[PDB]
Amino acid sequence: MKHPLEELKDPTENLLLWIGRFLRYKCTSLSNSQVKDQNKVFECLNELNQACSSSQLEKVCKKARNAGLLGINTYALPLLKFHEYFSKARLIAFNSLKNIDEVMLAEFLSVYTGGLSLATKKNYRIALLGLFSYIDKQNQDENEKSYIYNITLKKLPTHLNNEELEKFLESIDKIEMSAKVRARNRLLIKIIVFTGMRSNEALQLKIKDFTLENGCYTILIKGKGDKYRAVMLKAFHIESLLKEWLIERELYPVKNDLLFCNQKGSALTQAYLYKQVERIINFAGLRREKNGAHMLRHSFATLLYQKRHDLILVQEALGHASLNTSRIYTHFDKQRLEEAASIWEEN
Amino acid sequence: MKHPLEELKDPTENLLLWIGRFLRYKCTSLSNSQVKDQNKVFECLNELNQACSSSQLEKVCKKARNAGLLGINTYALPLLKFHEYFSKARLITERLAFNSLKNIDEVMLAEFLSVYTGGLSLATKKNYRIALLGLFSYIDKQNQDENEKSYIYNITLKNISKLPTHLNNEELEKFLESIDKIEMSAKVRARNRLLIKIIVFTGMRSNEALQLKIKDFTLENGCYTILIKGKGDKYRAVMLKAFHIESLLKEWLIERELYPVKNDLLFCNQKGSALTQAYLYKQVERIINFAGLRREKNGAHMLRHSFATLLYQKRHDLILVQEALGHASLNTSRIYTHRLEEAASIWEE
Amino acid sequence: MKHPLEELKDPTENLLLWIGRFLRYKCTSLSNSQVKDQNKVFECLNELNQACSSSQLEKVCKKARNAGLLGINTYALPLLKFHEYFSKARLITFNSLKNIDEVMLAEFLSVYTGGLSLATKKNYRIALLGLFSYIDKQNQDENEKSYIYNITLKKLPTHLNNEELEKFLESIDKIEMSAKVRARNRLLIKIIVFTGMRSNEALQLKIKDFTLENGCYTILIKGKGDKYRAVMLKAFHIESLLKEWLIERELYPVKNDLLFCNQKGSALTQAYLYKQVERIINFAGLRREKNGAHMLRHSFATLLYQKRHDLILVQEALGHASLNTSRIYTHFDKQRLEEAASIWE
Amino acid sequence: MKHPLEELKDPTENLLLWIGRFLRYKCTSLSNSQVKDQNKVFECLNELNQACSSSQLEKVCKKARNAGLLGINTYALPLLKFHEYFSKARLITERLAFNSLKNIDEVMLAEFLSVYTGGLSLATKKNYRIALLGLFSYIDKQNQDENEKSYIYNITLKNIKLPTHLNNEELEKFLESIDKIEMSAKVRARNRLLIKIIVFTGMRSNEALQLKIKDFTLENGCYTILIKGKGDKYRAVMLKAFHIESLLKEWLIERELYPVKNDLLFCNQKGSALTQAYLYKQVERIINFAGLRREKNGAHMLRHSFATLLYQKRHDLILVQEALGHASLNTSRIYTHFRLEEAASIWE
DNA sequence: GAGTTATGAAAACTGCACTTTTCAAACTTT
DNA sequence: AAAGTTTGAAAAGTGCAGTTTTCATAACTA
DNA sequence: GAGTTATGAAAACTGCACTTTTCAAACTTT
DNA sequence: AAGTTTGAAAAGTGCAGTTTTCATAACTA
Ligand SMILES: [Cl-]
């Protein structure tokens, strides 16, 4: 059903009401692929509708995110920040929901996104655009008439070079690891280095995703739409580690043919993987702007284009939906325009 | 017979009433071709003629499926999940409780899907959607009051959201070797080897091999012609060179005499009845692991893909693929007509 | 937006009301790509926006079809014939629209489709299914309740073989033609034989659809989705005829680079093309079950699979969306299953 | 600002009022990069407010398009057609659906499309749909009563290989035909130079027509040509001098007698820039003469030819993007695309 | 020990609604 | 005719709203 | 003359709903 | 060891529905 824009006497509570409706809608529309507990999500939907305060909305959205509904985090906090800005006590422009305009929103962004990055500022703006677009489509009185806001509010990533990649690979075997985790951790990080696959892609690998032929592994990676993409790496890079780890793995209560697992048998967390990557980066003395697994992913793509000069190959290997993403790992010398002008006089 | 939409005071109980009617209709409309015990299905239909609880509906449909009515599994579980959802959600979705079946709309169904399909495959989501669409399409067509007028749901759910796994010629050779090389007990070795080999060479489906009968085997010009029963009184044929199974077939038929099988069924369990896909899969996967060919799919159907692929690589005849596999549509046969190594070598000089 | 099932006291008149609504909807949903006069369509929709008699519905739907809205012809006549059936049976024995069921519809099909082909019978049934499906979706009373019908009502085509094709080609040049039409007609029919393109495809060909390279023409054929498919043809088959006709073509007031045209300068009709093809068929002594341009299309597809045994090749050349369509030009020998069993060796 | 949905007695004239409001907004939001004489546009923005007839609105939209505001053409004509539909349908049929703006819905719009897009291409139909959706989305966001409440249409409408080019051998024949075909002494040097520059660099029609001599820089036998883009941004292409050396010097001498405006390299007899229409005619004329007539016979087809050849020669997708000036690599990817003889030989 | 849970912040993607452009017949001028 | 321009028509091209994931640290358990 | 207009009939396609099956972990029996 | 039950994940297809052409009559030029 639809609701009138203003149902309550208190404008701040009415704003909170629309924010709750919006965040609840997003919980039902955003991806649920990583939801671990279906029952917690169901509870969240009801608890969002029963919420009467900002702190309550915050708690339930956190509950939703921690249950596997990751996408909600981008929308929740920014809108709760705006509610705080709107509800702030003042003396002597905030007595109605219809007073909210682009002037007010611009002021809010300026105050609340001061020491935040440009990317974070973008997220805040997107969240605002989503909320008021929702309100415009869902508010309505008995005359089937509505109030309309119409709010619009109108290069190489950090990486390791070839030589630094060599040192990093050496450091994986040179750094100290306990006997319980050394085989597993070295295998996990090296696969990421040699394939450039994402963090969650590596942590969710299965044994049956692996096939060996002519001294080279083909690894299938499950993606969106349940579509698989393939990556290849030479067997000798991980043959010794894989043989060693599979033996140790037999002592674990591992579930669903999962390759990497903790002692309990479940998949490792991003937090654990990051710290294992970062401490090796430190040991190698290679600390920079970014120091995690995705930084290694940027490194593989950069090296791939440097070695092969094939943009399509980068797209297919990295799993980019568009070549415009693959472009980020390239730089064009303007003098090379001469190569295009020379096609008429040489093959 | 048509019924009024709401005959009870409890909407949750009224929902159960329509679900039971729908599931009984599907049992009579969906294929009963694979049903062995007809009496069991009749008993199921008898129970579904009365009002049943959720627990009772679950038990009945399971009994029907295990009897041979396979199609019911696609509709049964998702709708029982929705009843479970509706019984608790109708009270706490909003401040005011949903006290009527008319409160069920497209938004509610969308929310049910998002919650109950979290973490499941895209294919599973589609099955749930199809199940929900079928139920309320049925209600729209079978409900009416005294004046022959009906309530219409009109649920639409407009939101809807390479080469298959196989073994190449070299891998197929290694698999055939492993069939004879792997350890099997004397009681099942002859039967299982013959069963799996026929699948590999002909590419017939699992149930087709499990339902093979002795009278459908003919030998001429050093080649077998195997007839496979299809829809109704239809039969499709496959051919297989004699020397591939002639030794095994003779050996198995001898040992088959010790089994208490009541008919001319070729393959049978220790009790005499037909083997299941579950046992066939386990034996196939076991040989695959032994050969080190473990991958995305490790069943008999993967061997079926391997046959279709190899057939197209050797003859390049799409019509031949259709006739050999028994495809009704050439859009299926077309599938078997479908530079990462360069990226993997960058680490070397 | 929606109307009660029964608004009038007379059931027969109320039936015409729903038929008129359905036919108006189809004039809005069916393809208008072939419409030549937009003003005629404008007049048709205006007339269909009110209550019409049976004769009026027939006249208006005919006007729409003749204006280029071809699809409407499949729905109009069968439904108007049902109204005639309903009116007669009501007076002889039907008190309400609710009385219409599958038993009644089955009897109608038995009486009115007698002597007609199975394909024609199928068209009648499809029209009935469309009407009552529409009514089920559009009827509603003041209480938001509706009546539901739920009506369900539950080998190689004629061609010329290789030898007959050769005789037909010779007959095109051998038969007598007027000097004013000979060059154009010979080229038009030969292109159909050599490419197997549809009738309307040949009639709407443009000069710039032709490109010549290394003694071979590539003809681009515009089809569904406004997408083009390519067919190739050896130059020596039509190059002389093409050069001759283009010269003669300069005498015509033809526009938009249209290849074939009448003396007025516009595209030729299907009626003229059929009669030209048919008289050559009769002259060659090749008359059979089908004698038009589409029979030549079936002949091309049959020959293509015969000489190449490539089903994909047939699909792409003929412009089939699915391979199941191309299948009808194939004949599988059941003994060839041994060829599939010998792949292991 | 915002206005009440219904201010006029005649809903037909009220419809035109909203259409005029919408088109004026598009004139101020769509690109004004190709706009020379900005005062002519400010003139149009005023005449858009004053337009109270279909003829007045049609005239100013054409005036705006001529001024360089090209994007308006996609929206103006389809909405002028709908106004024509609404107007005559109301006066003739007198159906209740035309007695108020509120009675316009998806059904009415569907009937309009079936009538006014009959015999038209699918691409054109998509343009008509976009224009209709844009109009009523604008009205939903700009209408208000005294109590700041709005009527909402929420209109939704049901949805509806290598590009044509010359290969390397065909490009050779085309280049020869440029010099072989007959041209008058007045235009031969100008036309040959203009077309050859397009062939060798693959730049767009408008880019070539707006070239200026000051943006040319010769160094060691190779030209660097700057091409003006959006804002203050320029892109560059390179061109070997021997391709155009003779033609360039010859044309510049003839150019001395022209009353050239804005320091343009190419111009008409009056001194102003040549149009795409004239450029197309000259290219098509050579194409026909060379016996290369195909599905597309303009300068953009020559552009497709350059990109296709460039990728076949070097297999460098980034090089293609930079040389052609593609903003998106999805466009550059098209030139990586691509057994019909096997079916044509069945008659032998 | 060998890892997890929680979290504000900062990206890392994805695709289509919409913008921007030329095609090419009809028309006008010198 | 040569030398152009106007115009309906038909695309050709892409910026940015919107979705999904990781960064990188604190607080746990011992 | 060389074609068009009109028409009931007879196809010639096109595409996606939804029916039917196996996968494969968990569970049971001889 | 030798099986079956079961939630889950596909594998596969018949038919509603759309868009032509067939083939003849009746014309005029
Ligand atoms: Cl590249």
Author numbering:
A (entry chain A): 1 to 92, 97 to 158, 170 to 362
B (entry chain D): 1 to 161, 170 to 346, 351 to 361
C (entry chain B): 1 to 93, 98 to 158, 170 to 360
D (entry chain C): 1 to 160, 170 to 347, 351 to 360
Give verbatim lines from the article:
In bacteria and archaea, chromosome dimers are monomerized by members of a large family of tyrosine recombinases, the Xer recombinases. Here, we present two crystal structures of the H. pylori XerH recombinase in complex with its recombination site difH.
We then co-crystallized full-length wild-type XerH with a 30 bp difH DNA duplex. The resulting 2.1 Å resolution structure shows a synaptic complex with two difH molecules and four XerH subunits. Each difH site interacts with two XerH molecules, one molecule (molecule A) binding to the left arm and one (molecule B) to the right arm. The two domains of each subunit form a tight, C-shaped clamp around one arm of the difH site. Perhaps the most unexpected feature of the XerH-difH synaptic complex structure is the DNA conformation, which is nearly straight. Both DNA molecules in the synapse resemble B-form DNA, with a wide angle (165°) between the two difH arms. Instead, the main difference in the recognition of the two arms involves a conserved thymine base (T4/T5') in the outer parts of the arms: In the left arm, T4 forms hydrophobic contacts with XerH αK and makes a specific hydrogen bond with lysine K290 (red insert), whereas in the right arm T5' is closer to the center of difH and cannot make these interactions. The catalytic tyrosine Y344 is far away (5.2–5.8 Å) from the scissile phosphate in all subunits, so the structure represents a catalytically inactive synaptic complex, implying a conformational change is required prior to catalysis. The pre-cleavage synaptic complex crystal structure contains nearly straight difH DNA, and XerH is in a catalytically inactive conformation.
